Amino acid sequence: GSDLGKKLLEAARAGQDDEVRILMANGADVNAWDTSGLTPLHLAATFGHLEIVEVLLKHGADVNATDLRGDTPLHLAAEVGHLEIVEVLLKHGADVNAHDTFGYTPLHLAALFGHLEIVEVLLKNGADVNAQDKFGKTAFDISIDNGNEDLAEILQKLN
Amino acid sequence: MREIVHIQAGQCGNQIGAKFWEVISDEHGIDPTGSYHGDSDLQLERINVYYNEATGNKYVPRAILVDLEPGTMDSVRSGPFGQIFRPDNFVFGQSGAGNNWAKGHYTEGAELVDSVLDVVRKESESCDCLQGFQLTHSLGGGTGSGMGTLLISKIREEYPDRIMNTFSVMPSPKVSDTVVEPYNATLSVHQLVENTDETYCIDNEALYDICFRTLKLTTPTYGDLNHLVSATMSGVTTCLRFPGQLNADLRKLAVNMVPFPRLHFFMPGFAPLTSRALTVPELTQQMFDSKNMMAACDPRHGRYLTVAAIFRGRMSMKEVDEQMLNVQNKNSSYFVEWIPNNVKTAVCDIPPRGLKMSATFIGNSTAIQELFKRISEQFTAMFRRKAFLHWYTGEGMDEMEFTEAESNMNDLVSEYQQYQDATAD
Amino acid sequence: MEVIELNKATSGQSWEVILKPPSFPSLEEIQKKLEAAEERRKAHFAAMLERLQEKDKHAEEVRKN
Amino acid sequence: MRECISIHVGQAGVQIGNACWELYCLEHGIQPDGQMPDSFNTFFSETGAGKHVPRAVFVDLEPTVIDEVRTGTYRQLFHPEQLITGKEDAANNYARGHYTIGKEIIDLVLDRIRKLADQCTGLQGFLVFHSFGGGTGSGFTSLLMERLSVDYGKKSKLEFSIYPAPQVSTAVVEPYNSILTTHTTLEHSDCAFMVDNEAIYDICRRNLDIERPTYTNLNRLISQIVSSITASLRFDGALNVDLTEFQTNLVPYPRIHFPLATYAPVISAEKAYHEQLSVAEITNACFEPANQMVKCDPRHGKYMACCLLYRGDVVPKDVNAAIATIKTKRSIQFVDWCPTGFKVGINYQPPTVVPGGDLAKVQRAVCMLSNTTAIAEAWARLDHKFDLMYAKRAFVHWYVGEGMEEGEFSEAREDMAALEKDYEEVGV
Numbered sequence A: 001g002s003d004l005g006k007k008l009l010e011a012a013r014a015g016q017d018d019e020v021r022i023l024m025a026n027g028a029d030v031n032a033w034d035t036s037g038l039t040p041l042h043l044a045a046t047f048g049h050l051e052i053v054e055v056l057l058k059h060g061a062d063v064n065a066t067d068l069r070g071d072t073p074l075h076l077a078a079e080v081g082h083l084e085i086v087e088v089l090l091k092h093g094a095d096v097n098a099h100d101t102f103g104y105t106p107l108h109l110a111a112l113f114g115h116l117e118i119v120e121v122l123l124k125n126g127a128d129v130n131a132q133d134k135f136g137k138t139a140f141d142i143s144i145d146n147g148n149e150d151l152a153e154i155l156q157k158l159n
Numbered sequence B: 001m002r003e004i005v006h007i008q009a010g011q012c013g014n015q016i017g018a019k020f021w022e023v024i025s026d027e028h029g030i031d032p033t034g035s036y037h038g039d040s041d042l043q044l045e046r047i048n049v050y051y052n053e054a055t056g057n058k059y060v061p062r063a064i065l066v067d068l069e070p071g072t073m074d075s076v077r078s079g080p081f082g083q084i085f086r087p088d089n090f091v092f093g094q095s096g097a098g099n100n101w102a103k104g105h106y107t108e109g110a111e112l113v114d115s116v117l118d119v120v121r122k123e124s125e126s127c128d129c130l131q132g133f134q135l136t137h138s139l140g141g142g143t144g145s146g147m148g149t150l151l152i153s154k155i156r157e158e159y160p161d162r163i164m165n166t167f168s169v170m171p172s173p174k175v176s177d178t179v180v181e182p183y184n185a186t187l188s189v190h191q192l193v194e195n196t197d198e199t200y201c202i203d204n205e206a207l208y209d210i211c212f213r214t215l216k217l218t219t220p221t222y223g224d225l226n227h228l229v230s231a232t233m234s235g236v237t238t239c240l241r242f243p244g245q246l247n248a249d250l251r252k253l254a255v256n257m258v259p260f261p262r263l264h265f266f267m268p269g270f271a272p273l274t275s276r277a278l279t280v281p282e283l284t285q286q287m288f289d290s291k292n293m294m295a296a297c298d299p300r301h302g303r304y305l306t307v308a309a310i311f312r313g314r315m316s317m318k319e320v321d322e323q324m325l326n327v328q329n330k331n332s333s334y335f336v337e338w339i340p341n342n343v344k345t346a347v348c349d350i351p352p353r354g355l356k357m358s359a360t361f362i363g364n365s366t367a368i369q370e371l372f373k374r375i376s377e378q379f380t381a382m383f384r385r386k387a388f389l390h391w392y393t394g395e396g397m398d399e400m401e402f403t404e405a406e407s408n409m410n411d412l413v414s415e416y417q418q419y420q421d422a423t424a425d
Numbered sequence C: 001m002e003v004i005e006l007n008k009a010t011s012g013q014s015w016e017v018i019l020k021p022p023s024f025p026s027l028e029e030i031q032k033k034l035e036a037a038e039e040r041r042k043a044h045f046a047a048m049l050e051r052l053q054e055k056d057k058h059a060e061e062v063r064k065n
Numbered sequence D: 001m002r003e004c005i006s007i008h009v010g011q012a013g014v015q016i017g018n019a020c021w022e023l024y025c026l027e028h029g030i031q032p033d034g035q036m037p038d039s040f041n042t043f044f045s046e047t048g049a050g051k052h053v054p055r056a057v058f059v060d061l062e063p064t065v066i067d068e069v070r071t072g073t074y075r076q077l078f079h080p081e082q083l084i085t086g087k088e089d090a091a092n093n094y095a096r097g098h099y100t101i102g103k104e105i106i107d108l109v110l111d112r113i114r115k116l117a118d119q120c121t122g123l124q125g126f127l128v129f130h131s132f133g134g135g136t137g138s139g140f141t142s143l144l145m146e147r148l149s150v151d152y153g154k155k156s157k158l159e160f161s162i163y164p165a166p167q168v169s170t171a172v173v174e175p176y177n178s179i180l181t182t183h184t185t186l187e188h189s190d191c192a193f194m195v196d197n198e199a200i201y202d203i204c205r206r207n208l209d210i211e212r213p214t215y216t217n218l219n220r221l222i223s224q225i226v227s228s229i230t231a232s233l234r235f236d237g238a239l240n241v242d243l244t245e246f247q248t249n250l251v252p253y254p255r256i257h258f259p260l261a262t263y264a265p266v267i268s269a270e271k272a273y274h275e276q277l278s279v280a281e282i283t284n285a286c287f288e289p290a291n292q293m294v295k296c297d298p299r300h301g302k303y304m305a306c307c308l309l310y311r312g313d314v315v316p317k318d319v320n321a322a323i324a325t326i327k328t329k330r331s332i333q334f335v336d337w338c339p340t341g342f343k344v345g346i347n348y349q350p351p352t353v354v355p356g357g358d359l360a361k362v363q364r365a366v367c368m369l370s371n372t373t374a375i376a377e378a379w380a381r382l383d384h385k386f387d388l389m390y391a392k393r394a395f396v397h398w399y400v401g402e403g404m405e406e407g408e409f410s411e412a413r414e415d416m417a418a419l420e421k422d423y424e425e426v427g428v
């Protein structure tokens, strides 16, 4: 979406709440992709900009939009440890079991990052614990290899 | 015979490399077919440093062209000097590195690395007396960054007795392709600290600033930035290419410019800052000015450990001497007192294209810590949130590698601070 | 003033003017030193090579599949 | 016969060597091809064809400087065997010159020296020309001096050493190379004539009105001084007739073997016809610090020995009258254990200059050779520069990586500290 598309991506990365609003009204494309296929949603999800995530979604952003590595905004919020954003995406129809080009599910990424509360909300929302990445690893395997005892207990109940 | 083997890796590496070859071929009188057509014997005296002598009076760059992206082959080959390169010196992959250091260093790059080394070996073994290696690459991408540093470490183990010199393009958000650039650059700096003898820090932040703030160029292309890179590259290699008593080979340059093995990152500078005649005092003042540095660091914030200055053209050599000593006497506080006579000047009669007089600056300054601090702060902002970490761990990398690269760049910053505060007891 | 040592040669002459009197095979070691330097330089280069050979083991720890 | 072999090591040694042999040829009437239309047989050998060949060796670790000799004006003067070159230089690193690169050519260099020594029937010894600053000039010279002391145990070794100056220098590491070579050569040299590039630079600017002296301008002045010192060995005079006499006349204490040379007159060739300087005027100029080959203040020092070497139209009674005035009007302090007298030598040939050169032909010239404690100031200048860098270990990694132990830097500096003390002890 030309100049508006690049400006919208910049404002979602920077967390310029009021600038995102100004650009939407002017017609900036909500799913305007960057060099790596990241939409303003992915950028807000990485950097932890909760309000921007909510404004983008109310302005019809694609909750399951996949970048070029195949990561949706749910994979990114789970990796970056943004619990509140993981809750907002889930409530707005995010794919709990979405798979990137490496076979990672959001649970794979939350377990590797050691985000205990995110793992709890992902499992509550139906994340498959038996999913295997292209390395043949489940999220339980990730926690045991990392040496994360508290997380392996949290995942063993289902796996 | 003091031969240099030139390597160009990735998109940036091949673009700045091609521009270096076009610029130095014009200075040496070499046309795109490899034929000489100049008016001076000084042009051919040290031609062997960068060119191999070919059949029927022809000259061929001692250059190896590398990329994981195949489309790079085509763009170079289509350039004005595209035909000058040896076809068997093009080593190109087919899948690309996707701006990922891990892909360049451990996956796609690891698969192509042996093929490059075979070409390096062939060029090196034909040299009468190899000086060392010159590599062009960016630190922000995947191929130049990841594969370039893998190439450096493999050349270092095979040729430990030869100089390793790099022209390394530092990323900047002002000129940015992706947010993963701080990761790619930090992982690379770690490798450069350990495996190169001397590195020219070509900062995209400084290039952007010079273009817009010095020439008022509102929309710089990579071509606009590369005009500054090619002018600098020509200038810093002047004493290697043209008959000259001072800074004859890369080893002699490294010996006098590098007091501590890890502190080998130079801040290049150039005057006058033109676009696509100054007096000796004007050239001298411009050369030491923050606005003329190719690294976005204020020299005034640090101290020079060593300085090399190369003047090009027909000028009063008495005026050069007086002007150079004047800078040191009037601004004594910007040079460490514990390295006596640490400012060296050389004069070459041949000026660069479209200029009657020019000056090239090579500074080994503690102020370069500002560039490393900038990258480190961006790396830390990204790494704390673990953003895009799966791209790297998915290629087999461990998070400890990131922690280690971060610690070693911060150790490099503190080392520069240590010598900036050191007193001549 | 006193003029001693008046030596007269073919293309020259020499003398002194006294104003006042005074009041009052190691070759094997060279080979051993150059040997030491060479063995030290090799030990330095071999340590750089072991450290690079160490990194090569780490890079083989990625292409497992 | 009493032959002397000249050895030129590195760029400075070779280029000064070129200027010296050019001047020796002009003085002795030898053409650049060796033909001549003998006292000089001490420096030149004679073939069956009547060709006069310099008893000289030229060594460099890289070939560019010696290649210019091989193809220049004097390409037929020296035989190819006398001109030795490597492929890679010492890159301003003493360690490369002495250890890693030097070890590869030392045996070949000694073999070539032996070929010249075999042609001698009464070899006196060697005259070694080199810089203190260059990796080859410093490192290779010290290795060669070590090997010559073993292979020619009874032979005298004299040096002509190019002392570094920022106004004329190529390296930041040159103070290191200077101390390193001095330490390792000290016990292997009988007498060394230091040539401070700043003193030569100053004389060319002040007396020859050359704003920017080139190596040609500097070397023609250096060769004029070197010729004044070696004339006695080439013309059979009565003072310093053999290499052993230099030590006897100028060196009472073996480690303190660095005499100060003072030369006069240095006159521009491009200046209006002037009344020729008298014996008294050129003798008075010998006590003028501006005419010294090494910058130092002799009024702060004490004399151990003093030789005056005159050349040209010089009357012995005029010298005696000049010296009498010098003992009166000036304060020349000798050490309490030295005879206080001046040794005098007179060579009656008119001083020779390069035709078309910067130096004017003079009727009478003089070189004073004085062993003064004031020269310790030149050692203090180098030691201070060494100290500044060594305290931080700046550049030391380059040497350690080229077959040298870090401890050698400390051993060298401790020897220089002892040498400074030797001068101080004599100075009281």
Ligand SMILES: Nc1nc2c(ncn2[C@@H]2O[C@H](COP(=O)(O)OP(=O)(O)OP(=O)(O)O)[C@@H](O)[C@H]2O)c(=O)[nH]1
Residues within 6 Å of the ligand: D009, D010, D011, D012, D013, D015, D016, D060, D061, D062, D089, D090, D091, D092, D093, D130, D131, D132, D133, D134, D135, D136, D137, D138, D162, D163, D164, D165, D168, D169, D170, D171, D174, D197, D215, D218, D219, D222
């Ligand atoms: N007077 C004089 N000094 C010289 C000359 N060339 C170099 N120097 C000085 O000697 C030092 C440089 O040492 P060199 O002899 O040139 O080096 P080298 O022995 O050839 O070793 P490499 O340079 O590595 O080949 C500096 O102090 C220079 O100022 C010369 O022709 N005349």
Ligand SMILES: Nc1nc2c(ncn2[C@@H]2O[C@H](COP(=O)(O)OP(=O)(O)O)[C@@H](O)[C@H]2O)c(=O)[nH]1
Residues within 6 Å of the ligand: B009, B010, B011, B012, B013, B015, B016, B069, B097, B098, B099, B100, B137, B138, B139, B140, B141, B142, B143, B144, B145, B169, B170, B171, B172, B175, B176, B177, B181, B204, B207, B222, B223, B225, B226, B229
């Ligand atoms: N100065 C300059 N920087 C460039 C150029 N091309 C790319 N870069 C920079 O280099 C980085 C991209 O790396 P690149 O070499 O293009 O990709 P690779 O092939 O995957 O290594 C970014 O930081 C860019 O800003 C160029 O032509 N000039």
Ligand SMILES: [Mg+2]
Residues within 6 Å of the ligand: D010, D011, D060, D062, D065, D089
């Ligand atoms: Mg040389």
